[PDB]
Swiss-Prot record, chain A:
Keywords tagged on the record: DNA-binding, Transcription, Transcription regulation
Domain of life: Bacteria
GO biological process annotation, one example: negative regulation of DNA-templated transcription
Protein's gene: yurK
RNA-binding keyword on record: no
Any coiled-coil regions, as ranges: none
Stated name of the protein: Uncharacterized HTH-type transcriptional regulator YurK
GO MF assignments: DNA binding; DNA-binding transcription factor activity
């Protein structure tokens, strides 16, 4: 019972794209991507642990803009003239590993909602992908059809 | 994923019962109003995929229990018998934990994590018409929102 509809920067490293990342972003195997990890709190309780990847070949230098309090949507718009037009989201449950348990302050093995989101711009071009993890005791999702 | 429920059939039972507090609150009817409690299972193959419990207020849909049978589209009954079509719905998604009844119908263990989708359907004038709780084992489904 706290409703998500349907910011601390931990790290950002430039890494080669894994198979599933390269597949979602429609880019070459091992392409350079920025791996941005952020924790969203509400309140001093960790609410969402976010890992987003930006293809450096589309947004060259995008890592350099990253910092606490920075709106990446504003960076995309102001710096690269890109605004997302739609997104595709999948929702599953996955199970916390060492990293998630640290940042979400939970136990290894705890059930987490995983939202796997791919954002797109004009002509169905993927621009970034995000995986948001939330402890299942801490959130309810609202969907208004 | 697994099996894919996009966001945005055997009849187990139907009984006429008094509305609970939460059901009467959702349906905006008097406490203990008569409701039809329709329980159904939807199967993937032989695998139980959704255990549905839906409540229809008998005061809005008098005699609606008499239309209930395997294979019946309740949306069809509402439309032809009552001239009602839903115009929108609210849905909440949570995780809950199987008790004896769910464990039987969903063929899982007591205590297993289930997704619960809590749905209220509405017609013209924002009038609630029925409410549903769908339970699905967490290993067996992925939801898509696009």
């Amino acid at each position: 019972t706290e409703n998500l509809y349907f910011h601390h920067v931990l790290s950002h490293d430039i890494i080669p794209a894994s198979k599933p990342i390269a597949e979602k972003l429609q880019i070459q195997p091992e392409s350079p991507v920025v791996e941005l990890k952020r924790i969203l709190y509400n309140d001093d309780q960790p609410l969402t642990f976010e890992v987003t990847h930006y293809p450096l070949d589309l947004f060259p230098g995008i890592d350099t803009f990253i910092a606490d309090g920075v709106s990446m949507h504003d960076i995309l718009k102001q710096q690269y003239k890109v605004v997302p037009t739609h997104n595709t989201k999948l929702l599953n449950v996955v199970y916390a590993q060492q990293e998630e348990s640290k940042y979400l302050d939970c136990d290894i093995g705890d059930a987490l909602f995983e939202i796997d989101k791919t954002a797109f711009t004009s002509n169905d071009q993927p621009i970034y992908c995000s995986l948001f993890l939330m402890h299942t005791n801490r959130v309810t999702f609202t969907i208004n059809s």
